[PDB]
Amino acid sequence: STTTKYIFVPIATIGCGKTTVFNTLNNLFPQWTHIQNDNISKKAKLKICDLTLLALEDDDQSVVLFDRNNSASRERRQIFTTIDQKRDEHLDDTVDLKYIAINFIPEDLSEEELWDITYNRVIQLDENLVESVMKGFIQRYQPINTSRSPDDQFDHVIHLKLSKDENSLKSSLENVRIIIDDLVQNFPDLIKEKPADELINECFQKALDYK
Ligand SMILES: Nc1nc2c(ncn2[C@@H]2O[C@H](COP(=O)(O)OP(=O)(O)O)[C@@H](O)[C@H]2O)c(=O)[nH]1
Ligand SMILES: [Mg+2]
Numbered sequence: 001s002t003t004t005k006y007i008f009v010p011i012a013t014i015g016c017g018k019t020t021v022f023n024t025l026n027n028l029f030p031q032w033t034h035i036q037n038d039n040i041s042k043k044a045k046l047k048i049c050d051l052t053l054l055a056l057e058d059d060d061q062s063v064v065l066f067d068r069n070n071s072a073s074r075e076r077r078q079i080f081t082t083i084d085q086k087r088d089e090h091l092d093d094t095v096d097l098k099y100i101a102i103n104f105i106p107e108d109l110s111e112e113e114l115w116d117i118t119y120n121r122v123i124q125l126d127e128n129l130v131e132s133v134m135k136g137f138i139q140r141y142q143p144i145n146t147s148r149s150p151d152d153q154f155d156h157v158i159h160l161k162l163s164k165d166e167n168s169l170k171s172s173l174e175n176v177r178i179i180i181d182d183l184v185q186n187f188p189d190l191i192k193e194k195p196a197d198e199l200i201n202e203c204f205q206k207a208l209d210y211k
Pocket of ligand 1: 012
């Protein structure tokens, strides 16, 4: 009849834990599709928006974890505009697409704290290179604003934490739990009942200790 598919869109900078969070989710939900912009050649014929629509063709596949920073508003605009104009190449008219923003940078977080947390995660000439690339994404960062274009096209926003780890609880593991609880409440057809907490912890351990 009618199928609902989902595209999870981060708003993040480097080192906020996007890949760790998305890998944890995909370990829990192997049927979801994790597309990593960092794995795509900057001269690939099919770019991330193309691979996203390619994935959503199968009745198999209903979730794309769109793994890219999108720190700048123009990068969110690209997603909405490109998917909107190309989806009829791939999907029939019975497929409803929903866009879920995954906000990695709390609105009250200072740029200083954002830098301290992410820079220490990433380091822990090539150092200068990593640092200046990280500074570029932060320089371009425009916080999510659903009161105006383009972020008003999101169907839903999940607000994550970004903290120093406290009480031996990794920030990204807390965020995995936040996402699961939010989806169970707001999109109950997607995940029917929550995975066991020990399974979430193991799936996060796998992602965290990925080298
Ligand atoms: N201490 C700590 N490290 C984390 C956390 N989340 C991710 N990391 C680590 O921080 C680094 C960057 O995480 P990653 O998921 O690759 O960030 P990305 O650039 O947004 O994809 C990796 O070495 C992760 O293992 C966290 O909550 N706490
Ligand atoms: Mg990454």
